[PDB]
Design a protein around this ligand. Structure first.
Ligand SMILES: C=CCO[C@@H]1[C@H](O)[C@@H](O)[C@@H](OC[C@H](NC(=O)CCCCCCCCCCCCCCCCCCCCCCCCC)[C@H](O)[C@H](O)CCCCCCCCCCCCCC)O[C@@H]1CO
Ligand SMILES: *[C@@H]1O[C@H](CO[C@@H]2O[C@@H](C)[C@@H](O)[C@@H](O)[C@@H]2O)[C@@H](O[C@@H]2O[C@H](CO)[C@@H](O)[C@H](O)[C@H]2NC(C)=O)[C@H](O)[C@H]1NC(C)=O
Ligand SMILES: *[C@@H]1O[C@H](CO)[C@@H](O[C@@H]2O[C@H](CO)[C@@H](O)[C@H](O)[C@H]2NC(C)=O)[C@H](O)[C@H]1NC(C)=O
Ligand SMILES: *[C@@H]1O[C@H](CO)[C@@H](O)[C@H](O)[C@H]1NC(C)=O
Ligand code: NA
Lengths: 201, 273, 98, 239
């Protein structure tokens, strides 16, 4: 279909695992090949550029190979972190000057599942800063084995899980939010939640 | 000493239409042809591959195949870049090769003409304009010189590949390069801008190699009025030349045409009118 | 635009009734787009062979056309060239005496 | 070598005119416009080799390019269509092969603007139970009732944006998934230490930048014109 093909299309890995991303192209000539990282809704960050017939580069936890004879490149990520969650894009430039055209791959989507060391699953109620009759229910501090299901009631809203990173404390936590127009004890009934989940009051 | 010349002619009629055709010469003998219509370079002699292995030739040809497509797009882009300074139609010519000297000496060249004027060469490690070239070419030169990959390839082609290839050609093509073909001569006459003058013509055809001596003579007297024309090619890779002499009507008797050529082995041709 | 020079000459000494080769050598022209015809009695000879176009030191183009022919007393032979540098086609006749 | 794009986000209607602008102060001769669509690599639309130069790329149809100066290269959608919903990237470069990319522009072309509505934003203060159990305090921000889904949610403490301890839902959810032009909700969390939340000198704000109508967009309905705007909610820390 296209002159630059990436594999896998997408993959899910756990924090600390390595992974390898592939780029195969038919572009001729092949002056250089660049790997970009693109975070969700963000721009293109260059990781490395490979220029030699048989080339190897590195940049921190990123390393890459290029074999121009096979028209093949690999990007290796060592010891994946949460922040590696992104699309990785391969691009081949067909000239060593501005007369070149860029040939873009469609990208590989990487998801990295974070390590939650000390889980403390709980459901808390939070009140609105203005009219304190309004509230939400916060299901937080569960490990990444737990799945959050959408609500059975269509007048109850439940978000997907979401991991935040308190960087200065080296602390990550999962959370989901539920609200309606309803109690927090019943909010996540449609989800299989840990049995030792803390419900205060 | 033999000059090896790769001659490229590229015509760009407008933004879409172009063709590139190439011929290759070792001295005055054609060794290759590459028509726009052909994917591959054609040998025009049995020995045109020289002493290159099939793998070496295939690799060299591949490089040229990539070059031809790439060159075409680059010119089209350079035209866009300089717009509206330069417009179609455009003719680009390249003359590239090496001159071979005794005992491993050689000099390589790569000259580029734009609309029939020599403007650019490759020299040392980069493209440069030559004296008399227009200033606007400074931007194309800058862009071309940004391409380190092309610079490395061209340096290798000119410095290494060309002399090595041609050395092999001279060995492989020895018997053709050193061929001796005999001239045949014949005489004729016409009136030429004359009150009562005539123009005798001595025709000499089929000789190889090029060096030849042709003189009108009365006895031992070399007629100084002898005017020899240009060397004209025959289709069979031999040469044609005619030597004229403007004389007075009724003074043709006694005149002869003498032809000296390496192929005759001292036995000159003498044709008496 | 430089104007094409045309030279017409036989390969072998011309003799009536004897097969020969007629050459038409077109030089010193540019741009390289050109139409070359070899004529017998003002009519286009078929199966005329063309060399590959090439160019000289001075960057002007040249090409050699040639065809089998048999000279006679009566038959005329010519080379007709059309090039953008000329308003009308230029015709040079084979003169065996020249 | 930096490159900027404006706007960063745009909601437009079919048949309307849209101009995407790119600026670079690198004195680069060469500038390039691409669009990025799911399942495709970036594709070249138009490019330019200098002021006055515009050249067609691979997919030029429905776009006009304009290079009024060395600095500025514009992509003009004379008659916007839904097929032009995309993320647009500009790049610049000199004679070298490197193209330096801008941060991108998100464009949504709607068939009609009748359902465009800005968010309500509510800030939910930390549970005293969480504080005693974890010595941490999670604030929750909720943006509700907005359409379309072109919003940017950010957190601000004492007038400076914070990223640490933040996570925002990857996509807005539909409030009425049955309906064609459902309004959306979006939630975000900011988690801080209890002592940080307990500090009454700490001013917390959740801000939602909403992308909607421009000044020159026609509005025929009685309700307030749903223009591009910020909606926010705030709270102070407390012992
Ligand atoms: C290391 C990274 C790999 O990428 C590299 C490279 O970095 C990539 O950028 C990409 O380059 C591709 C082209 N470059 C090339 O193709 C390189 C080769 C250039 C060769 C130039 C040779 C010119 C003479 C050839 C003409 C004769 C052809 C007849 C062939 C028959 C040969 C018979 C056998 C003899 C061969 C051996 C001896 C030859 C000695 C010359 C590149 O597009 C060049 O710019 C093409 C044009 C070069 C010539 C420019 C002439 C100047 C023109 C000036 C115009 C001004 C007017 C403007 C309006 O791909 C590469 C692939 O290797
Ligand atoms: C290739 O040889 C050149 C010098 O040779 C001249 O240019 C060639 C392209 C060819 O036309 C020859 O016949 C010419 O005589 C080398 O160029 C020199 O490179 C050094 C450093 O690399 C530089 O300091 C000199 O100034 C260059 N010389 C000139 C005259 O400019 C070139 O390095 C050779 N490359 C390889 C890979 O062998
Ligand atoms: C000279 O050769 C080139 C290369 O083969 C021709 O360009 C190709 O034209 C064909 C048919 O028109 C297209 O399908 C290809 O896309 C072109 N190839 C490339 C590499 O672009 C060109 O048409 C030829 N010129 C003439 C006058 O015949
Ligand atoms: C381009 O040039 C060719 C050859 O001269 C000509 O026949 C043709 O009309 C031109 N094509 C276009 C698309 O302008
Ligand atoms: Na809380």
């Amino acid at each position: 279909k296209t002159q630059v093909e990436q594999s896998p299309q997408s993959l899910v890995v756990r924090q600390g695992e390595n992974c390898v991303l592939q780029c195969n192209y038919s572009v001729t000539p092949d002056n250089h090949l660049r790997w970009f990282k693109q975070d969700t809704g963000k721009g293109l960050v260059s990781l490395t550029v490979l220029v030699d017939q048989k080339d190897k580069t590195s940049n921190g936890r990123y390393s890459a190979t290029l074999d121009k004879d096979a028209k093949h490149s690999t990007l290796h990520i060592t010891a994946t972190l949460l922040d590696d969650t992104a699309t990785y894009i391969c691009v081949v430039g067909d000239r060593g000057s501005a007369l070149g055209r860029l040939h873009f791959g469609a990208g590989t989507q990487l998801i990295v599942i974070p390590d939650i060391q000390n889980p403390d699953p709980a459901v808390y109620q939070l009140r609105d800063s203005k009219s304190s009759d309004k509230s939400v229910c916060l299901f937080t501090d569960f490990d990444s084995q737990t799945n959050v299901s959408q609500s059975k009631d269509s007048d109850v809203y439940i978000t997907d899980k979401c991991v935040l990173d308190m960087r200065s404390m080296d602390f990550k936590s999962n959370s989901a939010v539920a609200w309606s127009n309803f109690a927090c004890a019943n909010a996540f009934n449609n989800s299989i939640i840990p049995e030792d989940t803390f419900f205060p009051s | 000493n033999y000059t090896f010349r790769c001659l490229q002619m590229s015509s760009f009629a407008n933004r879409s239409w172009s063709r590139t055709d190439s011929v290759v010469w070792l001295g005055d003998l054609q060794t290759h042809r590459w028509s726009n219509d052909s994917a591959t370079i054609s040998f025009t002699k049995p020995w045109s591959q020289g002493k290159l292995s099939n793998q070496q030739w295939e690799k060299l040809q591949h490089m040229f195949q990539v070059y031809r497509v790439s060159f075409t797009r680059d010119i089209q882009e350079l035209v866009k870049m300089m717009s509206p300074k330069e417009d179609y139609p455009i003719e680009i010519q390249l003359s590239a090769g090496c001159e071979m000297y005794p005992g491993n000496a050689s000099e390589s060249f790569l000259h580029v003409a734009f609309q029939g004027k020599y403007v650019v060469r490759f020299w040392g490690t980069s493209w440069q304009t030559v004296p008399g070239a227009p200033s606007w070419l400074d931007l194309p030169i800058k862009v071309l010189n940004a391409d380190q990959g092309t610079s490395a390839t061209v340096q290798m082609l000119l410095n290494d590949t060309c002399p090595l290839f041609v050395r092999g050609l001279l060995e492989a093509g020895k018997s053709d390069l050193e061929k001796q073909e005999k001239p045949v001569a014949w005489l004729s006459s016409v009136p030429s801008s004359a009150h009562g003058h005539r123009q005798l013509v001595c025709h000499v055809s089929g000789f190889y190699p090029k060096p030849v001596w042709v003189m009108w003579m009365r006895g031992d007297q070399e007629q100084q009025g002898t005017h020899r024309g240009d060397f004209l090619p025959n289709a069979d890779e031999t040469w044609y030349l005619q030597a004229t002499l403007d004389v007075e009507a009724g003074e043709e008797a006694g005149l002869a045409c003498r032809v000296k050529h390496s192929s005759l082995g001292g036995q000159d041709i003498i044709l008496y009118w | 635009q430089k104007t094409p020079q045309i030279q017409v000459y036989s390969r072998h000494p011309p003799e009536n009734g004897k097969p020969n080769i007629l050459n038409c050598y077109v030089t010193q022209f540019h741009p390289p787009h050109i139409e070359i015809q070899m004529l017998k009695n003002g009519k286009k000879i078929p199966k005329v062979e063309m060399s590959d176009m090439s160019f000289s030191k001075d960057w002007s183009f040249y090409i050699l056309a040639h065809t089998e022919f048999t000279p006679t007393e009566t038959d005329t032979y010519a080379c007709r060239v059309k090039h953008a540098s000329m308003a009308e086609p230029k015709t040079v006749y084979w003169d065996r005496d020249m | 070598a930096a490159v900027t794009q404006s706007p960063r986000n745009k909601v437009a209607v079919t048949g309307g005119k849209v101009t995407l602008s790119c600026n670079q102060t690198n004195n680069h001769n060469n500038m390039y416009w691409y669009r990025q669509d799911t399942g495709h690599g970036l594709r070249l639309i138009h490019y330019s080799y200098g002021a006055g130069s515009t050249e067609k790329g691979d997919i030029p149809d429905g776009y006009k390019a304009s290079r009024p100066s060395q600095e500025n290269f514009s992509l003009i959608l004379e008659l916007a269509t839904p097929s032009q919903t995309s993320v647009y990237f500009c790049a610049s470069g000199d004679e070298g092969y490197t193209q330096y990319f801008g941060p991108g522009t998100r464009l949504l072309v709607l068939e009609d603007l009748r359902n465009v509505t800005p968010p309500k934003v509510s800030l939910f203060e930390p549970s005293k139970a969480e504080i005693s159990h974890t010595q941490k305090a999670t604030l929750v921000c909720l943006a509700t009732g907005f359409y379309p889904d072109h919003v940017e949610l950010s957190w601000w403490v004492n007038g400076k944006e914070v990223h640490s301890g933040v996570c925002t839902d990857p996509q807005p959810l539909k409030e009425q998934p049955a309906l064609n032009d459902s309004r959306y909700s979006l939630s975000s969390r900011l988690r801080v230490s209890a002592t940080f939340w307990q500090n009454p000198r700490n001013h917390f704000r959740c801000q939602v930048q909403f992308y909607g109508l421009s000044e020159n967009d026609e509005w025929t309905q009685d309700r307030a014109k749903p223009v591009t705007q910020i909606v926010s909610a705030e709270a102070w820390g407390r012992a």
